[PDB]
DNA sequence: ATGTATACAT
DNA sequence: ATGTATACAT
């Protein structure tokens, strides 16, 4: 983005996501302007856009604060993504999907199968993460509803709430590596349930799929607390 | 009390009535002149209305009034039901404080007094005011700020609100007679939460959102052009 | 049409 | 510390 407003959005987003501007920190207009070497006006533009994005909260009485996320908020965000993905999957099973959209999502699932070797640790991380992003974008749009697609993507927009969040390409942790086989079995079950018009199953399996991220998070809290801050998308967690 | 704040209220009203139709570009100078204020509180208002979901930011700059069709009304009601079902399920699974259960149960008891001896005999205004309280209490019941925030966001579009197709907005026989069933569901939601029955709490709270969808479907079928005259539906493009 | 800096107000 | 109007820039 070639504008001061636009640059400030990019610069502040990066500082917030990395934990450099921590959750709970008040972002004063004059202080933020001086930090970025611009005036208060492009700063207000940037603060408004970052509030719309959900990285900042507006304070009663004026001003902006970096929205604070503790482990309970991450757990709730992952729960919400799961519920929304479960809705996208159920509505595709209930309302029906076009022949081409089913073929495309089924093709992604078959390609995801090739990321797995003969050993339980033998997984192509980068290949998996790129295809996993595609699968979840396809799932969000599958029932053809613009509103559902929009709400599913919004529920997946916080870095820790993304279907890409706790994957071994972000952080090469044994637990994240070994969680991929199970997650892939769920991708297959989601597509088969949608083809079979099994809305209750499609919802339940897509919702359970989001529990991979929560299980991986719980493993880290218990097994390597300080490593959390070193995992991308988790540096901003206040706890 | 601010120009920014007043402009949010004034523009929201103009959007909800269809005065500023879906697809209309809201220029900074044009909107400033319309509200008799400068561009600065206008940009503040346009940002807040984008967060609310009544406007979209355009890729090359500017704001446009978000277009809503009938498919959007059905989808928004579906999403509110799913979110309310989640708030209900998490309260049942995690548990609720003694005071929060007492407060929501008090609202339900107050809602019982809106009903008479005849099936049509219902206090519409009393019901709608208490219904808003119940749904705000349900959203906050499990004590999670994130859930509360997301449930409220899913209930913010006029046609997606738990108040949307009630007889105080539009006195239609079907809307009147749907209230007894909806009240039995409020009682079932609270009892399922007290009993830690998360699957029941979710199912009952989700079904409770189907009252609005059933009432909408009734109007489309039985009185199609009367829909516009229903508040919160005047902005629907279809 | 919007971006940007700033004076002036509470 | 920010709400607000406005001149001037892009
Ligand atoms: Cl939409
Ligand atoms: Cl200051
Ligand atoms: Zn996945
Ligand atoms: Zn209700």
Author numbering:
A (entry chain B): 6 to 244
B (entry chain A): 7 to 244
Quote the original article:
Here, we characterized Atu1419 as a transcriptional repressor of its own repression in addition to two other genes (atu1418 and atu1420). The structures revealed Atu1419 to be a member of the VanR group of the FadR C-terminal domain (FCD; Pfam PF07729) subfamily of the large GntR superfamily of transcriptional factors (>93 135 members in Pfam database). Like FadR, Atu1419 possesses a characteristic molecular architecture, composed of a conserved N-terminal DNA binding domain containing the wHTH motif and a C-terminal effector binding/oligomerization domain. We identified the short palindromic region composed of 10 base pairs and a degenerated palindrome bound to Atu1419 and the N5,N10-methylenetetrahydrofolate (MEF) as the effector molecule disrupting Atu1419-DNA interaction, allowing the expression of the second part of the HCA degradation pathway.
The structures of two palindromic DNA-Atu1419 complexes solved at 2.79 Å resolution (P6422 space group) and 2.05 Å resolution (C2221 space group) present a distinct neighboring crystal packing with an asymmetric unit containing a monomer bound to a single DNA strand and a dimer bound to the 10-mer palindromic DNA, respectively. Nonetheless, a tetramer, where dimers AB and CD bind each to a DNA palindrome, was reconstituted by crystal symmetries in line with the conservation of Atu1419 tetramer in solution upon DNA binding. The three monomers of the asymmetric units (one in P6422 and two in C2221) are similar with an average RMSD value of 1 Å for all Cα atoms making almost identical interactions with DNA, although the positions of the DNA binding domains within the dimers between the two crystal structures do not completely overlap. Each monomer recognizes a half-site DNA with helices α2 and α3 of the HTH motif making nine polar interactions with both strands in the major groove of the DNA. Helix α3 via Ser44, Thr46, Arg45 and Arg49 side chains is responsible for six hydrogen bonds with both strands, half with oxygens of phosphate groups 5′ of guanine (G3) at position 3 on one strand and of adenine (A5) at position 5 on the complementary strand. The other half is made by the guanidinium group of Arg45, which provides specific contacts with the N7 and O6 atoms of G3 on one strand and by OG1 of Thr46 with the N7 of A5 on the other strand. They consist of phosphate contacts with A1 and T2 on one DNA strand and T4 on the other. All Atu1419-DNA subunits contain a bound Zn2+ ion at the same position as that observed in both Atu1419–citrate complexes. In contrast to the protein-DNA complex in C2221 space group, which crystallized in MES buffer, the P6422 protein–DNA complex reveals a bound citrate in the effector binding pocket.
